[PDB]
């Protein structure tokens, strides 16, 4: 019924451009009202840790790193928690690590028991370095600080997605971490295969199994492509789990944008979210 009525409301009614422009107004207001601030991200000791000057994590929901803290390590990383459907910390949306934030990225993974990492960008995008390789090659393990990262096996989930089985070691404890990377999803755009994107989410959920640990989700800035993944996964859970009878995609995206800046970056990605959700409900 609830999924059904959602499509009815869609059919009763392609703008949408109006709705997303209203999402932008709400964002600008949260910043005017100081309900979303970027104080920790602007600190002079943290600025170099931001990939982009215009993308800072909100103080209210930022990931706070306490691991190695006794050693004098900063609590800071450009990343935010996003709440899941049950109200728990389901996602961590973070930027593509820089050469000097690789260690912080692994502190994050380690401290929060992360099992699955979703990557929605490439290392090199427009002739530009967009993300550092943080995973291991079969042929070179990766070392930052006290962590040793090791590639066990690689395969393709499908033509667009690489599934890497990683081992990470820290102080004699060992954990498996899975990374799924989506290869052909540009910036401000949409993936080449909405179906493959769904499969990525499907596989991430299988690998995640039970357990309260959040999915780690990133792209280059940790905004547009990251926010689309989180939103897709969030709405899938709603369905598998609980779709409200007044269910609104406008409210979901608003909620996301309140936790991670510009989560869902462009009108095009917003329309894409609608097409995807609509398809998902038909089945």
């Amino acid at each position: 019924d609830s999924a059904r009525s959602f499509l009815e409301r869609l059919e009763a009614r392609a703008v949408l451009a109006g709705e997303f422009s209203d999402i932008q107004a709400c964002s600008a207001a949260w910043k005017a009202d100081g309900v979303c601030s970027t104080v920790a991200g602007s600190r002079p000791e943290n600025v170099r840790k931001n990939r982009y000057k215009d993308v800072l994590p909100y103080d209210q929901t930022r990931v706070i790193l306490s691991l190695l803290q006794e050693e004098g390590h900063s609590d800071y990383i450009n990343g935010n928690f996003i709440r899941g459907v049950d109200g728990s910390l389901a996602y961590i949306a973070t930027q593509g690590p820089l050469p000097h934030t690789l260690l912080d990225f692994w502190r994050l993974v380690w401290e929060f028991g992360v099992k699955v990492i979703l990557m929605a960008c490439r290392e090199i995008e427009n002739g530009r370095k967009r993300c550092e390789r943080y995973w291991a090659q079969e042929q070179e393990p990766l070392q930052t600080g006290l962590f040793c990262i090791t590639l066990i096996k690689e395969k393709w989930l499908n033509e667009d997605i690489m599934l890497r089985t990683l081992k990470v070691t820290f102080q004699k404890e060992s954990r498996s971490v899975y990374q799924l990377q989506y290869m052909s999803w540009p910036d401000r755009g949409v993936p080449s295969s909405p179906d493959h994107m769904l499969a990525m989410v499907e596989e991430a959920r299988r690998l995640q199994g039970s357990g309260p640990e959040p999915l780690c989700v990133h792209s280059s800035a940790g905004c547009g492509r990251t926010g689309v993944l989180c939103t897709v996964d969030y709405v899938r859970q709603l369905l598998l789990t609980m779709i409200p009878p007044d269910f609104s995609l406008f409210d979901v995206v608003l909620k996301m944008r309140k936790q991670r800046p510009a989560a869902v970056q462009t009108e095009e990605q917003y329309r894409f979210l609608y097409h995807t959700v609509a398809q998902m409900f038909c089945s």
Partner: peptide
């Protein structure tokens, strides 16, 4: 190569 979005 400095700025992403807004």
């Amino acid at each position: 190569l400095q700025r992403y979005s807004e």
